């Protein structure tokens, strides 16, 4: 690698970071959008106020404003559903560590309630909230309302740092390694500039996923993040070994690799900044399929990349990884659904199954009511698109288990439901090849009617090769496709994946059988469960 390759390609100009004039050749169309107008101005210079007044049909008549609503608004967490729900916007938060309050939950419910059949909400595979039905004229008021309740939607889509994932049992599990909330909170504060916007990290070549590990279970999936903090003691000090570059895409899925770096606990933000600056400064900005950070690591070599991180650290110091970390390899991933004692004597948490992560406004209000009546007004989201209500006096559990809503959002659903994960799919997502959420529920129900089992088999349904529902981590994964029935008619199908493992002994699954019509999946899955996962026909 020539020295010229290491010249920073972006520069700070008037508070924002822009591609240098000599580094604009051959860039992709998204990079052109960012150059044409700085997306962060919609928030930081209140550009959204005037944009929101322009009728959408007029917005669509000029490239600048059409790019504003289709692309730039993702920097404000707003995602135009152009193809499948025209004129409506999905809105995605920052929610470090998946932690929400009842007041926040009620606020989100009140927003989606306004939109009737166009509204609903979803828990995401980054333990985050998305709401649906938003119309552009309402955006300024919603942004204000989010801030009022202590929420932000900043920098949650496009070429930004995505939701910081942590341990859903942080602070409450007797077996936790380290409470991840302070660290994920710090990361989110850094990323969003304390909810004002941080232009220093908003012009990346591509999305970038961070997590902080605090569980032996590795609930945080560090193997598939761009930056994962692995808790580790080094020379008598608490800190983190760093894994880098994990990612999924249509073209390539790769597990994170060691940076060969350890930082003290207090250097979590400094090293996040250094890595992001290196990625921002040096990353490829051509073909969008080759812009994730792992491609930069492959180009420079991990040592070459490490040197770039090191030079951007305070006092330019970056220690080598500790030989061992604190995560115990002898571990069995624990079920968090149901009632579990907390480390605080006399208190329990309850994990509740949210079928395919989908809720309506009335459901959100009911969950918020439960968190207030039984817990401390806190609701935690999980990456399996479920919830935990922590801090429940154990004496209240008997009454809680009798609550009617727990028949729908159950502490003990059938085992296949416990592990079921499904992306948005074509109900709302324009890239989706198939419907996912309703279909996955129907198929899983039919499968479980036919077989019993004791192994916690994890089934993931994703609607296109973007693999937002992470089919490569699943025991059985389903990737949407179009295929053919016996008469040659077009039908929805799935490519079936096997071999995904999570926890310390992680492994990426691969396609097992292509092009299975969705209507033929039940017998295939029933047999896979009996033959490979110890299931017993009923
Ligand atoms: C909601 C969510 C799936 C879910 O049902 O839970 C989701 C939904 C979408 N993803 Fe994703 N992704 C979601 C997690 C992921 C993950 C999983 C993860 O982070 O562990 C991945 C794979 C891991 C990764 O990125 O390394 C993922 C890989 C992508 C990709 C492919 C990335 C790539 O490098 O090629 C795209 C397309 C893109 O960015 O170019 C994408 C694009 C999208 C968009 C924004 C496309 C769009 O504008 O329509 C989807 C919005 C649909 C909608 O209306 O909900 N989504 N997406 C997840 C939101 C997470 C969050 O709260 O921030
Ligand atoms: S995997 Fe595809 S269909 Fe599913 S939410 Fe992501 S982009 Fe949409
Ligand atoms: Cl996006
Ligand atoms: Cl679309
Ligand atoms: K779920």
DSSP H or E segment with residue 99: strand 99-101
Cβ atoms of residues 389 and 349 within 8 Å? yes
Residues 6+ apart with CB under 8 A from 167: 97, 173, 176, 179, 180, 212, 213, 214, 215, 219, 220
Give the ranges where 380-436 is alpha helix by DSSP (H): 397-400, 415-418
Cβ atoms of residues 68 and 59 within 8 Å? yes
- Residue 463 Ramachandran class (φ > 0 left, ψ -120 to 50 alpha, else beta): alpha
d(CA 124, CA 421): 9
Domains of the chain: 1-149+336-413 (3.90.480.20), 150-335 (3.30.413.10), 414-538 (3.30.413.10)
Cβ atoms of residues 352 and 386 within 8 Å? yes
- Tokens linked to 272: 């996040």
CA distances (Å), 133 to each of 105, 115, 142, 344, 482, in order? 16, 6, 12, 40, 28
Q: What are phi and psi of 378, to 5 degrees?
A: -110, 135
Q: What are phi and psi of 2, to 5 degrees?
A: -65, 150
Q: Ligand 3 centroid vs 530 CA: distance in angstroms?
A: 39
Mutation probe of ligand 2 site: the residue of 464, 465, 497 with most atoms within 8 A of C-beta = 464
Name the DSSP letter for residue 333: P
Q: Is 328 annotated as a binding residue?
A: no
d(CA 318, CA 300): 18
d(CA 224, CA 241): 15
Name the DSSP letter for residue 103: H
What string of DSSP letters covers 514-535?
EEEEGGGHHHHHHHHHHHHS--
> What atom of ligand 1 comes closest to residue 424's alpha carbon?
5
d(CA 98, CA 390): 12
Dihedral angle sign, alpha carbons of residues 120, 125, 128, 134: negative
d(CA 306, CA 321): 12
CA distances (Å), 264 to each of 17, 92, 98, 268, 392, in order? 29, 32, 24, 7, 34
Q: What are phi and psi of 268, to 5 degrees?
A: -55, -50
The two beta strands, 421-422 and 459-462, are: parallel
d(CA 67, CA 538): 54
Kindly identify the ligand whose nearest atom is closest to the C-alpha of 422.
Answer: 1
Q: How was this structure determined?
A: X-ray
Q: Ligand 4 centroid vs 497 CA: distance in angstroms?
A: 26
- In Å, what resolution does this model reach? 1.4
> How far is C-alpha 393 from the geometric centre of its chain's CA atoms?
31
> How far is C-alpha 8 from the geometric centre of its chain's CA atoms?
29
d(CA 440, CA 399): 32
């Amino acid at each position: 690698v020539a020295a010229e390759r290491l010249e920073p390609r972006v520069e700070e100009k008037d508070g924002y970071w822009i591609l240098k004039e000599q580094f604009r050749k051959g860039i992709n169309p998204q990079e052109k959008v960012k150059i044409e107008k700085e997306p962060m101005k919609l928030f930081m210079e209140n550009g959204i106020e005037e944009l929101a007044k322009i009728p959408i049909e007029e917005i669509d008549q000029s490239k600048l404003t059409k790019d504003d609503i289709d692309v730039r608004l993702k920097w404000l967490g707003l995602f135009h559903r152009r193809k499948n729900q025209y004129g409506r916007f999905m809105m995605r938060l920052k929610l470090p560590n998946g932690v929400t309050t009842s007041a926040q939950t009620r606020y989100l419910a009140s927003v989606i309630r306004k939109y009737g059949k166009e509204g609903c909400a979803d828990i995401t595979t980054r333990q985050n909230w998305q709401i649906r039905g938003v119309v552009l004229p309402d955006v300024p008021e919603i942004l204000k309302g989010l801030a009022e309740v202590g929420l932000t939607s900043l920098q949650s889509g496009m070429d930004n740092v995505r939701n910081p994932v942590g341990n859903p049992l942080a602070g409450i599990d007797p077996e936790e390694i380290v409470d991840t909330r302070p660290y994920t909170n710090l990361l989110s504060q850094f990323i969003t500039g304390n909810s004002r916007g941080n232009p220093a990290v908003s012009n990346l070549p591509r999305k970038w996923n961070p997590c902080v590990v605090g569980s032996h279970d590795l609930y945080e999936h560090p193997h598939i993040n761009d930056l994962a903090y692995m808790p580790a003691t080094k020379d008598g000090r608490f800190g983190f070994n760093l894994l880098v570059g994990g990612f999924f895409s249509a073209k390539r899925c790769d597990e994170a690799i060691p940076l060969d770096a350890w930082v003290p606990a207090d250097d979590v933000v400094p090293v996040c900044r250094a890595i992001l600056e290196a990625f921002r400064d040096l990353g490829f900005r051509g073909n969008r399929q080759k812009c994730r950070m792992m491609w930069l690591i492959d180009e420079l070599g991990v040592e070459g990349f490490r040197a770039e991180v090191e030079k951007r650290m305070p006092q330019q110091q970056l220690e080598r990884a500790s030989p061992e970390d604190l995560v115990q390899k002898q571990w069995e991933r624990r079920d968090y659904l149901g009632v579990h004692p907390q480390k605080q004597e006399g208190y329990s948490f309850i994990g509740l199954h949210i079928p395919v992560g989908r809720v309506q406004a009335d459901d959100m209000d009911e969950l918020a009511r439960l968190a207030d009546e039984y817990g401390s007004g806190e609701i935690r989201l999980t990456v399996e698109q479920n919830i935990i209500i922590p801090n429940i006096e154990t004496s209240k559990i008997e009454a809680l288990l009798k609550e009617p809503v727990l028949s729908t959002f159950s502490p003990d659903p059938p085992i296949l439901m416990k592990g079921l994960v499904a992306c948005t799919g074509n109900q709302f997502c324009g890239q989706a090849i198939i419907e996912t959420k309703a279909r996955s529920l129907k198929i899983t129900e039919e499968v479980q009617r036919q077989v019993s089992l004791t192994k916690p088999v994890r089934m993931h349904w994703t609607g296109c090769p973007n693999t937002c529902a992470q089919v490569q981590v699943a025991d059985i994964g389903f990737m949407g496709c179009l295929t053919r029935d016996k008469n040659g008619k077009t039908v929805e199908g799935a490519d079936v994946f096997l071999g995904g493992r999570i926890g310390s002994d992680s492994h990426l699954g691969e396609v097992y059988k292509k092009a299975v019509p969705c209507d033929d999946l039940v017998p295939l899955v029933v047999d896979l469960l009996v033959n490979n996962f110890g299931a017993v026909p009923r």
